[PDB]
Every structure is written in structure tokens, then in C-alpha cells.
Design a binder for this molecule. Structure first.
Ligand SMILES: NC1=N[C@H]2[C@H](CO)N=C(N)N3CCC(O)(O)[C@]23N1
Length: 823
């Protein structure tokens, strides 16, 4: 296994070469490939000449475009603010679940708010070991007949971990820095070197605050406590011997980290434009680089083409003004050197490149036309900037080898983040740890929509789609065709986009390529986790059309299905809490009322034991024919095996089929509440349902009681939420207004229903909306968690344990990735 790293300079190649010799990672060999600039390395990775490089966030955006097709895979984790510990959040969510779902696991947290390594389930007496995230160590379950297990102690905090490393077996590491930790195990704001007498400030995760390093005998700056804001900040640094303010930058000499860098270009230019220091607003006034060329008299901006923007660079011959360390003024520490050597009056870089020392001739140039000390960058900056990242090809053929090497190299403490040859070679010198990013992350989700759009805005005039048009996302060709017919009559209110599946529609809406889509319940958790909201919902009640005639009216019964546990009146011995070992009948594996809801409740109350193992002998079409979930399944009256199959071949398949399994050979069936009324009172002419009576059956309540099949509203496993039309938060009002108007024309009572019908089509079934939809009802947003608000507390608890930590789609870790954005 090999990893070929692309270096952009002679100095970087020299550092990478040193790591080839010094860093011994078994199974994986590192190699270094020289190219002359950042862009030439990006092309080399696209072409397979190399596999990976570290990129500024600005270049991460540029590399994501079709010219290069690279994606970020590894980056240093950062924090926006202090958050609740995971255990305490889990405790709060589980305590906020539906109290009628009895016997649920409530985590046990310690005096620091973390998980006790031993976790136990009160109602079952089962205990197990967990990791720091409270996730069960599989295979450590112990039954109540045994003593609770012996579980390893929790992993130490970063400060205590590095304290024990610094000591390293010895009881005192003499002459070396030993971190000082508080009582929660986080870094004390003030840190001091036990031998040199120097002191400085750190944030809560131990990152040094620039401009606070203080030699002994001097007054140290005040160190802020509980600092969990670890995003990097773009800053403008100047010497205290000058006197101009930010608003007087016109005509000055400037040093920038680079033309493509976010801290050296995007952040200052963004502020120049918003403060109208630059006579520029759109691509009609030329390029941004030309406008900046008119603003400054002479600058060093590596990568620039304009002559005066390269005048101050000091690279030799072809190396001058190159995006490469061979240009001595390239990068954050090159821009600072350019100011230090008086080739510029101001340098544009980020806080992590500022001097550590408090005393000196440098200060910060704030955009509010004041100047402030180095350590006040959080209140004197040009914005938070995104993290930087290791990138590779979008195909990800080398992602695992790159991740494995860097993980092993960091474990062995290889010299990744420093070098005698120079600063910020291969990686930023400020970097302390590099971690894998979510597997589905791309530049959009890594940078965030705010910074992604801001970067795009400097390259093209982004025509923002109209708020009076709803771009509908379709998932197949017939839907696209019905949507094109809708657009033809809509007068421009409706347009169409094409995706392959509902999740890609969610992605399109997030990225501003579409505006709305109708989602099955099984996709709503991922949609809500990613930040979309229900705008309107499909109202399915055929008995009451009054909420559809008069909008906004009160709804007596939304009419969605209710999952129930159906048993016979004769079997008086069976209640909810003894279904273990009985004979269950499921419509099919994957059905929400017949499987997902029952399996969720069984898992919540029996330590995630398999619904396979929970019952005795069952019929659940979808399982393996050899399992006990198909023993009850009768294949086909016309024997071919078609047993336990997902077709009408299996006699026990579906709503009516699970009702068959109950009466024939079974004692409990998981079905919607409508199944018993549809197949009793002689409503089914078949011989098995020969005038079977509805009063012959009852439904099981979660409190151990029973009730007649008519009271499904108060004795159910869970009611399903309706299907929802989702959109972005800022677009809910427009989508609601446009859809309600379209419904007044082409709904079931539309004034123009002869021209188009929203809820039917000759092109197929359930296109765009379900064909049985009565109308769309605006979602009445309540002051609660959107998860509980949309799903209902019962469904939320039964299927998701009322938790925001489920991952039913790998898109969720990518779309919930936190960003370094500004207001
Ligand atoms: N806000 C809000 N309105 C309701 C309508 C259905 O009636 N839509 C939903 N999905 N819900 C689920 C729970 C609920 O309370 O019934 C509701 N929440």
C-alpha cells in the first residue's frame, strides 16, 4: 500500500521526504511528488500522479469544481460553543419520550456528566459496557442473575491525557511543560511553563491564544474562561508605527496569504465590498482581481496575474508570486513576513499565524475603523473562516489508505506539524490533530452553505431563483412528466427538477437546486435532521372534506393509519407485556405499522433483542425462509416455493394476509387499524372471512390492558404521521402560499380542475403526491422539537427512542456538520 503526497514547493518536498524516512507506518509507505504550485498539484491528484494534499478552504472550494473533482476527507475538528455532554443530552431526550412507552433505557451519568462505563436497564436488569459515546460494547451484556460487568475506565480528557503523556511514566517531567487542568478535566485558561517561567492563555481544548505569551516578570493578559469557540478568524495585522484605519486602506501596500486563500482573499474582499471601499458589486464591473488591483498601490498576492498585485513578492525568477513556499511571502507566515520586512502596510492572514508574544510592534486593524491588540482577534476580525482539509479524488479510491496512514502517523507522534525547513509545510503548523470527515461530506457540507455561496459569489453572478416559483423535485420519469404538465398550466408557479431518489431530492433542496418534494415517513428523520421543515402535509381522511374546503379549520381526525396489536377475544391470557414467545403475524418486513413500529417498541423495552428472537413462531414476509419468522408462513395454495415471499403468492402477505395468519394459526397480528373492519362483518367474501365478526377481536394497549377494535385512537402502538412536503426554513411561507393557491385551482374542488388534477395522473400511480390525498394542509408549527412536532411523541419514542442521535442515512453526519460562518 502506498500514499503519494503532492507537495507544492522545494521546501515542502524536503519536509515530506524527511517523513518518508522518519515516520515508519507499517503496511503503508509514503511517497512525495513535487509540483510547482497548488493548482498543478490539484491537477496531479485528478490525473492520478498523486493521491492527497492539504488545502486551504478556498482551494477546497475550487478543487470541488468539475475541473478537478476533488473532495475533502480529513480535517482538524473544531468547536463553536460549549455543548451539553452526550450522556446528559441522552438523559434529557429519553426522559422527554412518551411515558406510555414503559420500561425504556435511561442512561446513568456521573458527576462530570459523562456515561458511567457500566450502563444498566432498570426494567430488565441487564447491564453492559459503553464507550465514551455511550454506545454499547457488543458482547458485554450481563443478565440480572449475574453481577454487573467489569468495564474499563473512561478515556481521559485531552488535558489529563496529555498530562500523563508529558509525565510519561515518571512522576515529574523535569524541564518540560506539563499542562494544568481544572476539575472538569479541561485546560485551565492560564498555562505556565514550569521551568522557563513563561505564561500564556489557552482555550478550553488547550489551543494557545495568540498574543498572550508572557515572559516571567511581566503582566500577562487576562485569559478568558470557558472559551469553546475554536474556529479560525481572518484578521488584518498592521504595525503600531502606522496610523491608518481600515476605511483608509485605498492606495496602501498589502500582503495577502494568497489569491485563492479564504483568509487572504475572500474574507478581506468580502468586507471591502460590503463597506463599499471597492467600486465593485457584480461581474459587469469586471473581475474582482482587477478591482482590487485598482484599490491597492502595490501588493504581494501569490497566484495573482495583475502586475501591481505581484510587485511586492520576492520570489526568485519564475517562483515569484507563485502559490508555493518557493515564494517567500506565500501563505499566512509569508504574508506576515512581508509586513515584518516592510514590503506592505497590512497583512491579511488568520489568527493562528499571529505572533504568540503579547508585547511587540503588531496589532490588529478592525473593520470598524479601530485598532486592537493581537489577542482580541475574536472582536477584531474579518470573519470566521472554514476549516482546511486534506483532499483526494471524488472517487475516494485512496481515502482509506490516506486515513490509515495519518491515523497511524499521529499515534506514533511523527513530525507531521513542524519542520526545520519552514512553517506550514505539508500541514499548518498550528494543527494538532487530523480526523476523518463524514464519508458523505463534500465541499458544500464541509464549508457550509454560507461560505460556499460567498465563495461562489466572487466568481459568477448567482441569479437567485424567484420566491414565486416552486422547483419541484421528481424521482422518476413519470413524475417528471406529470410535473411538466403542471408547469404548463401553472403560469410559471411550478418548475421541475430530476433526481434519482428522495434523498437526492433532499440534497438538491439543501443546495438550492430545488424547493420542495413529498417525502414518505421513512425519509422524514433524515430530512428534519438536515434542517428541512414540513411546509404542508398530505391529508388522507376521506370522511371529512371540511378542512379542505375551508383552510385553517380545525381537524377532528387527520385520518392517518394507526398501528395496532390485533388479537382474538377468545385468547384472554395475552397482553402487551407477555408477547414474548407468542405467535406474531406481520404484514411484511419493512412495513411501518406491521414491522417498524412493533420492532421499535420491542427493541426499546428488551435491550435491542431481535424481533426474530422475541417471538416464538411467526409469519413476517421478508425474513429468511429457515428462520422462525417464516415457520407460520403458508407459501401458496397452488404449490410451485413462494413461502415467506414479498408477493400475493404468500397467503399471509399484506394487510389482509396478516389478518389471515391471526385467525388461522396465530395469536397476535401487527396491522393498521383498518384491517379488521375491512375483513369482518362479512365484508370479505372469502371462506376464511365467512361473516367473521368485528366484536370477536380486540387490540392490545401498552399498559397491559385491552380494548375493542373501535377504540384504536386511544389503544394503539403508534399512529403514523402524514406524508409531508418539505423545504428549507426560509422558503416555508412561499411554498405554502404557492401550493395552497395551486390547490385552489387544481385540487379536488379546484376552480380549474378540468385543466389539471394534482392528485391523479394517467402517467402512473401516486406521482408527486399520493393519489388518495384529499388535499394539502399547512403544517401548524408548534413551540417544541420539530422531531416531536412532526412525528408525534408516540411515534418519535417508539421508532427513534425520542432521540436525535439515530443515523438511518449516512447523509446525516454530512448534513449536520457544523460550520464556521458569520452573521
Ligand atoms: N404540528 C402538528 N400538527 C399535527 C399534524 C397532524 O394532525 N401534523 C403532524 N405530523 N403532527 C404529528 C403530531 C400532531 O400533533 O398530530 C401534528 N403536529
Amino acid at each position: 500500500r502506498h500514499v503519494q503526497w503532492c507537495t507544492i514547493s522545494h521546501l515542502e518536498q524536503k519536509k515530506c521526504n524527511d517523513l518518508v524516512g522518519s515516520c515508519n507506518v507499517p503496511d503503508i509507505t509514503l511517497a512525495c511528488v513535487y509540483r510547482s504550485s497548488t493548482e498543478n498539484c490539484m491537477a496531479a491528484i485528478k490525473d492520478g500522479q498523486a493521491d492527497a494534499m492539504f488545502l486551504d478552504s478556498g482551494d477546497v472550494y475550487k478543487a470541488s469544481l468539475d475541473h478537478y473533482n476533488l473532495k475533502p476527507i480529513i480535517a482538524e475538528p473544531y468547536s463553536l460553543h460549549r455543548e451539553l455532554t452526550k450522556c446528559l443530552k441522552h438523559r434529557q431526550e429519553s426522559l422527554g419520550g412518551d411515558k406510555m412507552v414503559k420500561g425504556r433505557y435511561i442512561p446513568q451519568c456521573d458527576e462530570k456528566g459523562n456515561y458511567h462505563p457500566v450502563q444498566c436497564h432498570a426494567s430488565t436488569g441487564y447491564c453492559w459496557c459503553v464507550n465514551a459515546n455511550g454506545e454499547k460494547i457488543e458482547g458485554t451484556n450481563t443478565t440480572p442473575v449475574q453481577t454487573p460487568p467489569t468495564c474499563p475506565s473512561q478515556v481521559l480528557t485531552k488535558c489529563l491525557k496529555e498530562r500523563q503523556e508529558a509525565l510519561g511514566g515518571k512522576r515529574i517531567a523535569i524541564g518540560r511543560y506539563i499542562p494544568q487542568c481544572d476539575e472538569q478535566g479541561n485546560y485551565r485558561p492560564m498555562q505556565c511553563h514550569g521551568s522557563t517561567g513563561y505564561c500564556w492563555c489557552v482555550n478550553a481544548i488547550g489551543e494557545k491564544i495568540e498574543g498572550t505569551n508572557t515572559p516571567p516578570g511581566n503582566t500577562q493578559p487576562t485569559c478568558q474562561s470557558h472559551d469553546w469557540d475554536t474556529c479560525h478568524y481572518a484578521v488584518a495585522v498592521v504595525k503600531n508605527s502606522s496610523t491608518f484605519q481600515f476605511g483608509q486602506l485605498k492606495g496602501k501596500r498589502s500582503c495577502h496569504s494568497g489569491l485563492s486563500k479564504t483568509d487572504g482573499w475572500n474574507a478581506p474582499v468580502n468586507v471591502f465590498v460590503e463597506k463599499k471601499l471597492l467600486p465593485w458589486d457584480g461581474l459587469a464591473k469586471g473581475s474582482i482581481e482587477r478591482a482590487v488591483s485598482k484599490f491597492f498601490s502595490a501588493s504581494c498576492i501569490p497566484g495573482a496575474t495583475e502586475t501591481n498585485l505581484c510587485k511586492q513578492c520576492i520570489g526568485e525568477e519564475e517562483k515569484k508570486c507563485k502559490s508555493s513556499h518557493d515564494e517567500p511571502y506565500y501563505g499566512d507566515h509569508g504574508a506576515f513576513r512581508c509586513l515584518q520586512e516592510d514590503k506592505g502596510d497590512v497583512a491579511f492572514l488568520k489568527n493562528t499565524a499571529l505572533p504568540d508574544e503579547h508585547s511587540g510592534v503588531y496589532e490588529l486593524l478592525c473593520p470598524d475603523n479601530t485598532r486592537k491588540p493581537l489577542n482580541k482577534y475574536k472582536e477584531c476580525n474579518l470573519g470566521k473562516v472554514p476549516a482546511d482539509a486534506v483532499v483526494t479524488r471524488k472517487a475516494g479510491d485512496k481515502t482509506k489508505d490516506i486515513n490509515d496512514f495519518l491515523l497511524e502517523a499521529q499515534k506514533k507522534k511523527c513530525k507531521l506539524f513542524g519542520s526545520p525547513h519552514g512553517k506550514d509545510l505539508m500541514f499548518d503548523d498550528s494543527t494538532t490533530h487530523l480526523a476523518p470527515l463524514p464519508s458523505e461530506i463534500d465541499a458544500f457540507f464541509f464549508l457550509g452553505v454560507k461560505w460556499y455561496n460567498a465563495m461562489k459569489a466572487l466568481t459568477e453572478d448567482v441569479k437567485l431563483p424567484s420566491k414565486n416559483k416552486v422547483r419541484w423535485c421528481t424521482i422518476n420519469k413519470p413524475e417528471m412528466m406529470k410535473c411538466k404538465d403542471w408547469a404548463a398550466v401553472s403560469g410559471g408557479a411550478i418548475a421541475c427538477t430530476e433526481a434519482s431518489c428522495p434523498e437526492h431530492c433532499v440534497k438538491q433542496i439543501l443546495k438550492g437546486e430545488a424547493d420542495a418534494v413529498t417525502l414518505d415517513v421513512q425519509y422524514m428523520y433524515m430530512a428534519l435532521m438536515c434542517g428541512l421543515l414540513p411546509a404542508v402535509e398530505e391529508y388522507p381522511n376521506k370522511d371529512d372534506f371540511h378542512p379542505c374546503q375551508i383552510p385553517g379549520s380545525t381537524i377532528k381526525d387527520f385520518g392517518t393509519k394507526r398501528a395496532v396489536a390485533l388479537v382474538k377475544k377468545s385468547n384472554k391470557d395475552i397482553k402487551w407485556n407477555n408477547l414474548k414467545g407468542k405467535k406474531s403475524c406481520h404484514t411484511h418486513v419493512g412495513d411501518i405499522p406491521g414491522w417498524v413500529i412493533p420492532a421499535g417498541l420491542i427493541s426499546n423495552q428488551n435491550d435491542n433483542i431481535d424481533i426474530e428472537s422475541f417471538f416464538g413462531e411467526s409469519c413476517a414476509p421478508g425474513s429468511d425462509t429457515n428462520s422462525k419468522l417464516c415457520k407460520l408462513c403458508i407459501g401458496d395454495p397452488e404449490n410451485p416455493s413462494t413461502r415467506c415471499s414479498l408477493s400475493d403468492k404468500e397467503a399471509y402477505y399484506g394487510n389482509e394476509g396478516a389478518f389471515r395468519c391471526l385467525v388461522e394459526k396465530g395469536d397476535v397480528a401487527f396491522v393498521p387499524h383498518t384491517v379488521v373492519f375491512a375483513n369482518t362483518d362479512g365484508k370479505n367474501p372469502a371462506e376464511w372471512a365467512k361473516d367473521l365478526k368485528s366484536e370477536d377481536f380486540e387490540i392490545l394497549c401498552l399498559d397491559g390492558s385491552r380494548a375493542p377494535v373501535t377504540n384504536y385512537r386511544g389503544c394503539n402502538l403508534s399512529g403514523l404521521p402524514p406524508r409531508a412536503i418539505v423545504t428549507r426554513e426560509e422558503s416555508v411561507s412561499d411554498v405554502v402560499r404557492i401550493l395552497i393557491n395551486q390547490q385552489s385551482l387544481y385540487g379536488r374542488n379546484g376552480f380549474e380542475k378540468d385543466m389539471f388534477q394534482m392528485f391523479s395522473s394517467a402517467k402512473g400511480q401516486n406521482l408527486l403526491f399520493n393519489d388518495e390525498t384529499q388535499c394539502l394542509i399547512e403544517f401548524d408549527r408548534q413551540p417544541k422539537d420539530i422531531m416531536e412536532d412532526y412525528f408525534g411523541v408516540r411515534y418519535y419514542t417508539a421508532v427513534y427512542s425520542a432521540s436525535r442521535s439515530a443515523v438511518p442515512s449516512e447523509l446525516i453526519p454530512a448534513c449536520t456538520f457544523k460550520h464556521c460562518s458569520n452573521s
